[PDB]
Amino acid sequence: ETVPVKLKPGMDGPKVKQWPLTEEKIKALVEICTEMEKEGKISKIGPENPYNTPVFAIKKKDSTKWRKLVDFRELNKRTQDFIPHPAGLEKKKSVTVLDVGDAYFSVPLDEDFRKYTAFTIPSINNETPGIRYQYNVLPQGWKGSPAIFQSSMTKILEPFRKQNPDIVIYQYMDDLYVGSDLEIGQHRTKIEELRQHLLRWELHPDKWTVQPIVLPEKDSWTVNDIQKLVGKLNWASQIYPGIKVRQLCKLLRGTKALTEVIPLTEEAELELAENREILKEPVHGVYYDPSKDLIAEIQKQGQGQWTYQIYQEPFKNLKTGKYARMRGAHTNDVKQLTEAVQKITTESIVIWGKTPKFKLPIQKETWETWWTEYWQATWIPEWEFVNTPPLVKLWYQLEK
Amino acid sequence: ISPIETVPVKLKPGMDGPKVKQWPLTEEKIKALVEICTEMEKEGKISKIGNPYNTPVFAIKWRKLVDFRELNKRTQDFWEVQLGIPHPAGLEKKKSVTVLDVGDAYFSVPLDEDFRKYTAFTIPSINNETPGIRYQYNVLPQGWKGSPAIFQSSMTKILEPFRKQNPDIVIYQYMDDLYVGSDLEIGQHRTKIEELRQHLLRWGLTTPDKKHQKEPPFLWMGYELHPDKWTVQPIVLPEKDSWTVNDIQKLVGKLNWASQIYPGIKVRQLCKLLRGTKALTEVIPLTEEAELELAENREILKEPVHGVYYDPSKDLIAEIQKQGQGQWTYQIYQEPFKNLKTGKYARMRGAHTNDVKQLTEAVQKITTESIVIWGKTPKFKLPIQKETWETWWTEYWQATWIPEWEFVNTPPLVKLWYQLEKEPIVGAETFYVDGAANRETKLGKAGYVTNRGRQKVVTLTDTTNQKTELQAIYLALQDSGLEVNIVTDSQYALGIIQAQPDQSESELVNQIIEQLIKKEKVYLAWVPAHKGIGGNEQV
Ligand SMILES: CC[C@H]1C(=O)Nc2ccc(F)cc2N1C(=O)OC(C)C
Numbered sequence: 057e058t059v060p061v062k063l064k065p066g067m068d069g070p071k072v073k074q075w076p077l078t079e080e081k082i083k084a085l086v087e088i089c090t091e092m093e094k095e096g097k098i099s100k101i102g103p104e105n106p107y108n109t110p111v112f113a114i115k116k117k118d119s120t121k122w123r124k125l126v127d128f129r130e131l132n133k134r135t136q137d138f139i140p141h142p143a144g145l146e147k148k149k150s151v152t153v154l155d156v157g158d159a160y161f162s163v164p165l166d167e168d169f170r171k172y173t174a175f176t177i178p179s180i181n182n183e184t185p186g187i188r189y190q191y192n193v194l195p196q197g198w199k200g201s202p203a204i205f206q207s208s209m210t211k212i213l214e215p216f217r218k219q220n221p222d223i224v225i226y227q228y229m230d231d232l233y234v235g236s237d238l239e240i241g242q243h244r245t246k247i248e249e250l251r252q253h254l255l256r257w258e259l260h261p262d263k264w265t266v267q268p269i270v271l272p273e274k275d276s277w278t279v280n281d282i283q284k285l286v287g288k289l290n291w292a293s294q295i296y297p298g299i300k301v302r303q304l305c306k307l308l309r310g311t312k313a314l315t316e317v318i319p320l321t322e323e324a325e326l327e328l329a330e331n332r333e334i335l336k337e338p339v340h341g342v343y344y345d346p347s348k349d350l351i352a353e354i355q356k357q358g359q360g361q362w363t364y365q366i367y368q369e370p371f372k373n374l375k376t377g378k379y380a381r382m383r384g385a386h387t388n389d390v391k392q393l394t395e396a397v398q399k400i401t402t403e404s405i406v407i408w409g410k411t412p413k414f415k416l417p418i419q420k421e422t423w424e425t426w427w428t429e430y431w432q433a434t435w436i437p438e439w440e441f442v443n444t445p446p447l448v449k450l451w452y453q454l455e456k
Numbered sequence: 457i458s459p460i461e462t463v464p465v466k467l468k469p470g471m472d473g474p475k476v477k478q479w480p481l482t483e484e485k486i487k488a489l490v491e492i493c494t495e496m497e498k499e500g501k502i503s504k505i506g507n508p509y510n511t512p513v514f515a516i517k518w519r520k521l522v523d524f525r526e527l528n529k530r531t532q533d534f535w536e537v538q539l540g541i542p543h544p545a546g547l548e549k550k551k552s553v554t555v556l557d558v559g560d561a562y563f564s565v566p567l568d569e570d571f572r573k574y575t576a577f578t579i580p581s582i583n584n585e586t587p588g589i590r591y592q593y594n595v596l597p598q599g600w601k602g603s604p605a606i607f608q609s610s611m612t613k614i615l616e617p618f619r620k621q622n623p624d625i626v627i628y629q630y631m632d633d634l635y636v637g638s639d640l641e642i643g644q645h646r647t648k649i650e651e652l653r654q655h656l657l658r659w660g661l662t663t664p665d666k667k668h669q670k671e672p673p674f675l676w677m678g679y680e681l682h683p684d685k686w687t688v689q690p691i692v693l694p695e696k697d698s699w700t701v702n703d704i705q706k707l708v709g710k711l712n713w714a715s716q717i718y719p720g721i722k723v724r725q726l727c728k729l730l731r732g733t734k735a736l737t738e739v740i741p742l743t744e745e746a747e748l749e750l751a752e753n754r755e756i757l758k759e760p761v762h763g764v765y766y767d768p769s770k771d772l773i774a775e776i777q778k779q780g781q782g783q784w785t786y787q788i789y790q791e792p793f794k795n796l797k798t799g800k801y802a803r804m805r806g807a808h809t810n811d812v813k814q815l816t817e818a819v820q821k822i823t824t825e826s827i828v829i830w831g832k833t834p835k836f837k838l839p840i841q842k843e844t845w846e847t848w849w850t851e852y853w854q855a856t857w858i859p860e861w862e863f864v865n866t867p868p869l870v871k872l873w874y875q876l877e878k879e880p881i882v883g884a885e886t887f888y889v890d891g892a893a894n895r896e897t898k899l900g901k902a903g904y905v906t907n908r909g910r911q912k913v914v915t916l917t918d919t920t921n922q923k924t925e926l927q928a929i930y931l932a933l934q935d936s937g938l939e940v941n942i943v944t945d946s947q948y949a950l951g952i953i954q955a956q957p958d959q960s961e962s963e964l965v966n967q968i969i970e971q972l973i974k975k976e977k978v979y980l981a982w983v984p985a986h987k988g989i990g991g992n993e994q995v
Contacts, residue, residue, distance in 0.1 A: 183542055314880035389857045
């Protein structure tokens with residue numbers, strides 16, 4: 057029994073190249089892949105199958121074993137289309153994610169669609185022709201899986217849902233998001249309860265928003281101080297038209313030494329005051345648009361600090377934030393960035409139920425050869441690489 | 457009829473079989489083909505038939521040739537045969553290594569009967585009229601899109617067994633070859649080869665007898681391979697009295713290739729000879745330098761470059777050198793002075809970068825390489841102080857990284873040619889710079905005004921929007937003490953400079969960089985253009 061899944065009109069199968077992998081990772085994929093083949097989850101394939109999808113191995117949150125991960129991004133895009141977001145999920149005192157990837161294997165994949173799910177296991181130095189396989193069951197990571205399995209998913213969920221209502225359950229791809237206001241102990245104990253249920257077959261959203269910008273405060277100001285202050289505000293006026301630098305810029309006339317101290321006019325004084333007040337809140341009229349793509353930009357602040365914004369339109373932020381590197385990532389820019397992107401995406405899902413498109417301050421090559429080494433999530437957002445404009449940085453560096 | 461199952465082949469969706477016309481051929485070319493097609497028929501490779509589709513047959517004793525170019529254009533895509541093949545440096549030492557030319561094996565594999573119809577071709581006639589001799593292929597056609605692919609795979613499955621039965625035996629299939637190696641004793645080995653051979657044969661696969669099989673060392677993308685080590689095939693540099701462009705280009709190509717293995721190779725002067733060349737056949741006299749350069753190269757190329765295979769039980773170490781700005785060299789070894797590999801990276805030339813950055817890139821290329829050669833990352837021995845690294849990285853605007861590495865003091869070291877001040881400098885003159893130029897004319901001026909009253913301005917002809925500003929800045933630098941402050945409304949400075957480049961495409965920039973490097977302390981500050989902002993309102 058299977059539903060006849062198809063590709064979007066006129067779309068052809070993915071033919072993406074496999075990137076090189078650490079010997080270690082390769083050894084695992086093979087171990088893993090033989091297991092699945094035994095259990096009939098996959099089958100080696102003929103050369104008459106030209107498609108391909110990248111695959112790799114990870115060791116997510118706390119484990120001595122490797123997990124197979126497949127990048128179906130392309131496939132996903134070409135897959136035809138087919139539950140809405142629980143506007144309250146965002147409003148719960150605590151959320152917990154769940155990996156229900158396994159549930160999928162319990163289902164046959166349409167016969168004529170499998171070819172497109174083809175993947176390749178490499179061999180160091182091309183000393184061996186790669187190991188070609190294609191799925192027989194719904195694979196983890198493909199957008200089709202959560203769907204075709206929606207039916208049996210809800211079915212097994214009702215009894216727990218209906219049993220609590222003060223708890224929310226949201227499913228994104230391989231993942232499951234659940235939130236409750238119950239205290240920590242109860243929350244967790246209740247989670248396990250859910251796991252148990254499923255077995256039969258740490259977010260706190262209340263801190264996320266657009267963030268507060270604070271301007272410097274000083275005993276005495278220098279020309280420089282003021283020039284910098286002014287460049288910032290001026291820019292900021294693309295977000296707040298009420299922000300004004302008239303008075304301040306007047307103090308800047310003549311050609312004084314960058315280090316000379318300037319006394320502030322009462323006007324300038326009020327101006328500063330007036331701007332501080334305008335900035336006390338996020339710009340008005342910012343509403344998420346479901347029809348548009350969600351954008352998530354990131355800046356390197358340094359010293360392990362990282363700012364980010366999530367918007368759909370320029371200078372209209374749905375949310376902004378800082379992220380400070382985790383323990384033991386010190387010498388690793390890539391790890392931190394990777395860490396943050398995952399965090400920002402989870403938080404994006406939690407809120408609007410989808411992943412944003414990232415703009416990364418890192419070279420494509422650097423990112424490509426190492427991101428997989430620290431990835432842990434079942435999903436994989438979209439991304440492009442960019443050059444950070446100096447001011448965007450200085451500005452967001454000012455958040456409280 | 458034959459052992460192996462066929463693979464299911466399809467024509468691209470919508471397309472259909474070839475329809476080409478058979479050229480007219482001489483009476484002696486026809487006879488030759490008639491005879492070949494009879495044998496082939498016998499041997500069972502082709503079947504007599506006489507089918508809408510047709511492909512042109514040729515004649516080059518005579519040897520036949522069929523043109524599938526059309527068929528191919530109509531043949532489904534396959535899973536491509538990797539063009540990325542083993543690099544000596546990533547191979548293992550074997551007590552022995554054989555090679556089995558399975559040349560005739562191509563035609564030893566059944567073609568999806570369902571698809572044979574398409575291969576239909578026709579032997580012409582002297583009689584423009586008479587019914588041509590019609591045939592089609594039963595096996596993989598020499599020169600057909602699918603051939604390469606299929607065959608390997610087939611081969612692959614046939615070895616599946618034997619490999620499984622012999623975990624201590626490495627087999628490598630390339631083209632119509634099989635590099636079978638191992639660490640067993642010569643008889644043990646010999647015996648196994650012979651075992652392999654009969655197994656292949658059990659599948660209708662033919663190999664040459666022991667009194668035919670090729671010999672070591674082996675030729676591999678530039679090297680001679682012994683089972684215990686490799687040596688570079690010595691490269692021959694012509695010696696002519698007349699050098700054409702073509703000549704110099706080939707040469708250069710060759711020389712460049714050498715740079716990797718051999719150290720000290722240069723082509724700057726040889727490369728010069730190609731300036732303004734009007735034709736490939738054009739003869740260019742070698743200058744003195746070019747005559748010299750070329751000489752030292754012949755000397756270097758004599759030297760035998762011997763190498764060592766990959767010992768999976770030892771550290772993989774890469775050490776790097778800056779052979780010049782943007783020029784880097786590296787060698788990868790496991791034992792001091794016994795490299796499995798070396799190479800150099802061409803002077804990548806950007807729009808604006810710095811050495812530390814460039815170093816980082818080299819490191820990443822190297823890394824990606826090894827991940828392939830060895831599926832592992834090397835421990836880096838780098839000509840840069842950890843202090844330097846930590847200073848630059850911790851604050852660079854762009855996410856960067858270098859895997860495990862250690863400092864190695866081998867001049868010239870890679871450093872920060874200069875560091876813009878974190879704060880304005882007290883007592884240091886403050887230049888308020890600005891440049892303006894007629895967008896369209898390429899006429900402009902650039903100058904500054906300091907707090908100390910010093911002023912200047914220059915008119916510039918044939919200049920752009922950006923160039924003036926930068927020049928403004930340039931001037932300020934020239935005309936200031938070892939310490940200066942410079943304020944500018946240039947967006948271009950804010951980045952390009954504040955991102956502290958020590959090399960660029962823009963010559964101007966280059967100059968500013970030279971200047972910057974010279975000072976003792978420089979603080980740059982940016983301010984919004986076209987504002988009541990003083991200084992900026994002077995400009
Ligand atoms: C089969 C053994 C395998 C290997 O590990 N080391 C060597 C060493 C020397 C050789 F001449 C060949 C090879 N081998 C190989 O596959 O090389 C192909 C590129 C020709």
